[PDB]
Amino acid sequence: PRAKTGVVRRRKHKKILKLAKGYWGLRSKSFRKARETLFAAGNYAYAHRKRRKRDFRRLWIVRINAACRQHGLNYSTFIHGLKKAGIEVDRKNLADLAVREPQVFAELVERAKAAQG
Amino acid sequence: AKHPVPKKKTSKARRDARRSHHALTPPTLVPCPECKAMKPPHTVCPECGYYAGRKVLEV
């Protein structure tokens, strides 16, 4: 029996061409240029997922180091404050608190410098 | 076949961009003195076009 290519090849090409929807020029029209692009996008996403974690923390910090600079304070010290203050809270992420709950942040600033001043 | 040659196939984008000036302009027409039909200016409008100069009469 002879098993011709048949229908199989067109299908694999369709699968990838669909993942390449919206890409520029041929990168979305040619199976080859599409597959090359997907390789790229595959590693970017993966690397960028690991560094999305970075880019946010970075943001949180800048946000914080500004709200407590309003209360005369280095971010660097503020953090040391909470470290010794026992306050293992903040979770830096939770400094929308510093933006949504200013009074609640201010009180933390106090407990902050309260220890090690 | 010979010396200088294109190094890369020009994209659909860049060729059509070249065409951005290939658009046509419709003929400048004016209503005709006698006949109602439209004809281009300063030409003996093709239906008895003038008066003093022979109007290549369709009459």
């Binding site: 914080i64 992420n93 929308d96 933006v99 | -």
Partner: protein
């Protein structure tokens, strides 16, 4: 819990003196001000920063022999079109450039980097249009 992101907020205006202030030291601050990194709702992708006005821009102090030794260069696309300009001449010819240039180079590069520079009105000596506010500072 998504991180908070500010809406159109407030177009702030701030006034600075310059006279006697070093230069880079002042530039540092004016930059951080330009991109509201003092505001606790700082956002890198938006431009929610203060508009900065600066007066007495020509009485910017500066250490060492920088009046003679420090040179600003400019390359025209042409051959030998690299021009060299010393601080002295700049100040004497076009102050407010010496400081504008120190800030341009301290704002980030990009379409947003620009624009932030646009939000910076440097003037020779005192005076300027006082349409908006101007909470002067140090």
């Amino acid at each position: 819990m998504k991180t908070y992101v500010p809406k159109q907020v407030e177009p702030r205006w701030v006034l600075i003196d310059a006279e006697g202030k070093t230069l880079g030291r002042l530039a540092t601050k004016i930059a951080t001000l330009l991109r509201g990194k003092h505001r606790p709702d700082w956002t890198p992708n938006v431009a929610m920063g203060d508009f900065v006005v600066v007066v007495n821009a020509d009485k910017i102090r500066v250490t060492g022999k920088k009046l003679e030794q420090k040179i600003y260069t400019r390359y025209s696309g042409y051959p030998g079109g690299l021009k060299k300009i010393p601080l002295e001449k700049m100040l004497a010819t076009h102050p407010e450039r010496v400081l504008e240039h120190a800030v341009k180079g301290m704002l980030p590069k990009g379409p947003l980097g620009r624009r932030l520079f646009k939000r910076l009105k440097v003037y020779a000596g005192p005076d300027h249009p006082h349409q908006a506010q101007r909470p002067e500072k140090l």
